[PDB]
């Protein structure tokens, strides 16, 4: 949404562009646009969503 | 000087003008071709037009 995807080698995070404050990639700070066959530079990773743990607690 | 891949920087700049960044990545080849041809036009304009 705002920021960039940064990896310290083995774990992917979202940070704001001007101050390194890392946060886990999640559905509330990244948006989605189609499938990923058109983008060059894609990397596979998990986008953990916050509703699934609450729903799985049921 | 902090370096960013030029594509991601162009995405930054599209966010700057109001267009979302996915528009660049989905259309990166087309945008590259437009920029290259636009630079090519300048050479004709300078060399030929007096
Ligand atoms: C990477 O850059 O950042 C990860 C941040 O999650 C780092 O992974 C965690 O590191 C802390 C501190 O060492 C550990 O307590 C955690 O167990 C570990 N894993 C998770 C899932 O939180 O992971 C990771 O170590 C780090 N890698 C490098 C090379 O710096
Ligand atoms: C990145 O920007 O540049 C890499 C250059 O190594 C790129 O990976 C591959 O590297 C081999 C090395 O011999 C080249 O022969 C390949 O052409 C090159 N692949 C491409 C697509 O150029 O790795 C890497 O792909 C490229 N990353 C992106 C997102 O373009
Ligand atoms: C990404 O994380 O996951 C994709 C899904 O499996 C991965 O795409 C696979 O690529 C291999 C090799 O090109 C193909 O043999 C598989 O058929 C293909 N899977 C699908 C569902 O299309 O695509 C993709 O490679 C992987 N990213 C990386 C960098 O490995």
UniProtKB/Swiss-Prot annotation, chain B:
Job description of the protein: Subunit of the fusion protein that is processed upon entry into the host cell. Mediates fusion of the virion and cellular membranes by functioning as a class I viral fusion protein. Contains a viral fusion peptide that is unmasked after S2 cleavage. This cleavage can occur at the cell membrane by host TMPRSS2 or during endocytosis by host CSTL. In either case, this triggers an extensive and irreversible conformational change that leads to fusion of the viral envelope with the cellular cytoplasmic membrane, releasing viral genomic RNA into the host cell cytoplasm.
Name the UniProt record assigns to this protein: Spike protein S2'
Section of the entire sequence shown: 893 to 942 of 1273
């Amino acid at each position: 949404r705002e920021g960039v995807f940064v990896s310290n080698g083995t774990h992917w995070f979202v940070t704001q562009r001007n101050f390194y404050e890392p946060q886990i990639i999640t559905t509330d700070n990244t948006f989605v646009s189609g499938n990923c066959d058109v983008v060059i530079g894609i990397v596979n990773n998990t986008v953990y969503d916050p509703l699934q743990p609450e729903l799985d607690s049921f | 000087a902090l370096q960013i891949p030029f594509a991601m920087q162009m995405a930054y700049r599209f966010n700057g003008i109001g267009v979302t960044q996915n528009v660049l990545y989905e259309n990166q080849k087309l945008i590259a071709n437009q920029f290259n041809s636009a630079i090519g036009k300048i050479q004709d304009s300078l060399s030929s037009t007096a």
